[PDB]
Structure 1
Amino acid sequence: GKKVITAFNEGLKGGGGSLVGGGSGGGGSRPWFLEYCKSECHFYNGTQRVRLLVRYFYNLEENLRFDSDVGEFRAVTELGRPDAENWNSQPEFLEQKRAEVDTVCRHNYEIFDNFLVPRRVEPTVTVYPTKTQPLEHHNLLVCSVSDFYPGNIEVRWFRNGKEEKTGIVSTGLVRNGDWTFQTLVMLETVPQSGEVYTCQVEHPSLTDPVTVEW
């Protein structure tokens, strides 16, 4: 299923006037001007429930918006009202943007569903203490879970069969940018011979919970 991904139609804005006194953080800086647009598809259950949300930004300001549940453009700040009024008086263009929840959002999800949705990468679990010699206080037990996808994961520490729910220090879910995540869920504890600390990892690429004792 190697079909062609569709892009959203970028509408052309019109001239006319200016607005009085704009903002500008300043503090001495190079002048810059940015026209930026995010056409978002929000899937609540695949293509069953979908909502298109277009977001316009001029520099640091979000100024216009298109919520498919409205069906028209709506200014967020006054900088975007001219576009709202212009685009909204254009019937064809509206029927067109409205159609994009189907011609773009749904159409593309069916494509990505073949590979991005079902993507799974199993994690690598690794435990290990932290701090040289005695911590002169509680020591750190590190549960490293790296190289996984999707992000949904549960990593639980236990102490002698009991789940430790306090004393946890974590980086939280860390995104590497290459479609893999990682995370270190540490545990402030002083080691004690026959005593045991266990890390349990649950993730959709697994069939059964990964446990690692130390």
Structure 2
Amino acid sequence: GKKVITAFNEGLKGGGGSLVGGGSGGGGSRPWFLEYCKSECHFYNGTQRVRLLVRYFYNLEENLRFDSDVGEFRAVTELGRPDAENWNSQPEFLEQKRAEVDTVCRHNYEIFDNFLVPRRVEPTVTVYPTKTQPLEHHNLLVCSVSDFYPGNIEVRWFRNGKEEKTGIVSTGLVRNGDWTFQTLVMLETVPQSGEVYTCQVEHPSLTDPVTVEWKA
């Protein structure tokens, strides 16, 4: 169903707590001023345990936050002290904030659990050698895993049946920004005309492990 996504409500800041400033890079650098806020919902076992963390930043510094496990706003730096004292004295606003863990976090999670949590995209797996430089060091066997979601993936290396443990290098999980990941897992060995290598890939979008052999 098409359920409405709700947003966290932001509070208005008042006056007071003026500071002389600090003194950072500048002079020639162009001035800029940023009011940035992130409200993060942390889930554990779905909605079993949820923690809400709101973080306020002004330019380069986080100055205030709302940890739903604390129940009250708390200044990270002087600059945020005014808001903490102010919003903490508005019982109505606090009650509202305290409930967002359910009216916002748990609420939106439920909606996203219908398509985002269950989203799964099968990886495209390939295998091939590289580094045509038998003068630089050793020979490298690359196992390419691309275009998959979610990010949690496991790629092992097998040489003639028995798995390899050392000599493994990777570029790690690379995020593409479009809900797909990619990664290259290499094996540092010395390919022989009479050798069989395999790359095993375990991923939640695969009923059972995908394998790809390679022989010289």
Asked if TM exceeds 0.5, the reply is: yes
Alpha-carbon separation, structure 2, partners of 1:136 and 1:16: 64
Alpha-carbon separation, structure 2, partners of 1:171 and 1:18: 47
In structure 1, the residue matched to 2:146 is 146
Alpha-carbon separation, structure 2, partners of 1:29 and 1:162: 59
For residues 31-81 of structure 1, the C-alpha deviation after alignment (integer angstroms, 9 at most, x for no partner) is 111000000100011111001100000011000000001111000111100
Unaligned runs of 5+ in 1: none
Kindly state the Cα deviation for residue 135 of structure 1 after the two structures are TM-superposed. 5.1
Q: Which is worse superposed, 53-62 or 184-193?
A: 184-193
**Within 5 A, what are the aligned runs for 1:1-214?**
1-26=1-26, 28-132=28-132, 134=134, 137-214=137-214
Q: Which is worse superposed, 127-136 or 162-171?
A: 127-136
Kindly state the Cα deviation for residue 162 of structure 1 after the two structures are TM-superposed. 2.1
Kindly state the Cα deviation for residue 134 of structure 1 after the two structures are TM-superposed. 3.6
What number of residue pairs does the alignment pair up? 214
Alpha-carbon separation, structure 2, partners of 1:93 and 1:8: 12
Conserved in 2, the CA contact under 8 Å of 1:52 and 1:67?
yes
Cα distance change on mapping 1:136 and 1:72 into 2, 3 Å: closer
Measured on the aligned residues, the alpha-carbon RMSD in Å equals 1.3
Unaligned runs of 5+ in 2: none
Alpha-carbon separation, structure 2, partners of 1:28 and 1:172: 39
Alpha-carbon separation, structure 2, partners of 1:197 and 1:20: 66
- Identical aligned pairs, as a percentage? 100
**Aligned to 1:35, what secondary structure does the other structure show?**
strand
Cα distance change on mapping 1:136 and 1:83 into 2, 3 Å: closer
Instruction: Normalising by structure 2, report the TM-score.
Output: 0.95
Cα distance change on mapping 1:133 and 1:34 into 2, 3 Å: closer
Conserved in 2, the CA contact under 8 Å of 1:137 and 1:190?
no
Alpha-carbon separation, structure 1, partners of 2:129 and 2:135: 10
